[PDB]
Design a binder for this molecule. Structure first.
Ligand SMILES: [Ca+2]
Ligand SMILES: [Cl-]
Ligand SMILES: [Cl-]
Length: 447
């Protein structure tokens, strides 16, 4: 197979990430980990402190510089890249202290002076619809707005990015990219070595002054329409409608899009329509669709139970806790380990040679099935009945692991879970319980 999917290990520290790469992400074929911001940020326990930078020293809640490097190396040894959440728009609000011991205040930081910032003003709600200048030059919730047109600012951010590349970081999330002119991002990328993966966070559901399409020339772009519409369909619509999901629904080009069911902001209600781990099996099924369907570069969300406090930081117990995995309950949720989601990743990994949707079938409502040509086939039953339709595939006849429920043995003789039969004529006689699914692919076939 080939790498197709990455994961946000939200608020995971560098030792937990490194261990997770070795024990799970490498073996299961995840391509990369998006880590929380690793630069110096304001002190305090809330998750949102990570988005208030104080400097570019690599001392953060996740760990120190040596720990960060050890993580990059341990993950890369098992084939997993690191993408860094990169704060290109701003520095912390107000005054205080950072996680490396530095002080700041009055738009004075270890590496920035007041002249390195746009003149202070406030982004007001109306500005998103009618004032691009203010969205991009004024302050987002009090954060000091860097003058991203300045050569010094561009050189300082680029030096941060290039230091990360020199220690092995392979990609970058440009936080708050809507708040930075795409032209400024273009000037920054000219100072960045090489061609790392770059994706830009731009929330654009339509109807505002700045469009996500403005950022296509400078890197990948978050397609927030994807999760918003997918959530609405899974909650209130029909899965049959998804037969032409993608550009036909008004989305950006597939080859530019980072897609996801939810992210750290919008799982806190910051779309009521967004699906999250709180939705249980409905979330499972949405992720199976996303990962089987050939649109975009998907990012699986990996969350913690925040017990109703949308500002709280993560659990005070590590993920890997002296031999106990603190997953699936009221600490870390570890969605990337949920069987249907990890199985979806394996499916995407092994269908990457055929980015077509073939033999689409539905019952006009909430039962669907489709193929990736002869590389794979899937079905979802999001109804209260058993799905027993006979569907056409392009798969070679034989017996296949349902990779949502099990894995092929090292000897290729058996599956650890359900086995699916492709008939002589390429059909499958489905037998899918209510709110269940199946996926098979050409590299999980019994020999
Ligand atoms: Ca700005
Ligand atoms: Cl450092
Ligand atoms: Cl994002």
């Amino acid at each position: 197979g080939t790498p197709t999917t990455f994961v946000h290990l939200f608020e995971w520290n560098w030792q937990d990430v490194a261990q997770e790469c070795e024990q799970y992400l490498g073996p299961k074929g995840y391509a990369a980990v998006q880590v929380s911001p690793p630069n110096e940020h304001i002190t305090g326990s809330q998750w949102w402190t990570r988005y208030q930078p104080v400097s570019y020293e690599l001392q953060s809640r996740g760990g120190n510089r040596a720990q960060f490097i050890d993580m990059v190396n341990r993950c890369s040894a098992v084939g997993v890249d690191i993408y860094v959440d990169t704060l290109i728009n701003h520095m912390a609000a107000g005054s205080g202290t950072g996680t490396a011991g530095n002080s700041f205040g009055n738009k004075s930081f270890p590496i920035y002076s007041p002249q390195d910032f746009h003149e202070s003003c406030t982004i007001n709600n109306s500005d998103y619809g009618n004032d691009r200048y203010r969205v991009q030059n004024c302050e987002l919730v009090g954060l000091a707005d860097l003058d991203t047109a300045s050569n010094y600012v561009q050189n300082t951010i680029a030096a941060y990015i290039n230091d990360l590349q020199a220690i092995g970081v392979k990609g970058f999330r440009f936080d708050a990219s809507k708040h930075v002119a795409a032209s400024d991002i273009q000037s920054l990328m000219a100072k960045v070595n090489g061609s790392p993966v770059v994706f830009q966070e731009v929330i654009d559901l339509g109807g505002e002054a700045i469009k996500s399409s403005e950022y296509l020339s400078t890197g990948l772009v978050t397609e927030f329409k994807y999760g918003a519409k997918l959530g609405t369909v899974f909650r209130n619509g029909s899965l049959a409608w998804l037969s032409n999901f993608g550009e036909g629904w008004g989305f950006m080009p597939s080859s530019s899009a980072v897609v996801f069911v939810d992210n750290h902001d919008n799982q806190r209600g910051h779309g009521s329509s967004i699906l999250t781990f709180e939705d249980g099996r409905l979330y499972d099924l949405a992720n199976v669709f996303m990962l089987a369907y050939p649109y975009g570069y998907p990012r699986v969300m990996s969350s913690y139970d925040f017990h109703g406090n949308d500002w709280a930081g993560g659990p005070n117990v590590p993920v890997h806790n002296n031999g106990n995995l603190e997953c699936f309950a009221s600490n870390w949720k570890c969605e990337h380990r949920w069987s249907y989601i990890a199985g979806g990743v394996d499916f995407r990994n092994n269908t990457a040679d055929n980015w077509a949707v073939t033999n689409w079938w539905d019952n006009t409502n909430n039962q669907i099935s489709f193929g990736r040509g002869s590389s794979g086939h899937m079905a979802i039953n999001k109804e209260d009945s058993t799905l027993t339709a006979t569907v056409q595939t392009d798969m070679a006849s034989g017996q296949y692991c349902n990779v949502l429920k099990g894995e092929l043995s090292a000897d290729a003789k058996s599956c650890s879970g359900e086995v699916i039969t492709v008939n002589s004529d390429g059909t499958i006689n489905l037998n899918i319980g209510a709110w269940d699914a199946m996926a098979i692919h050409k590299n999980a076939k019994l020999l």
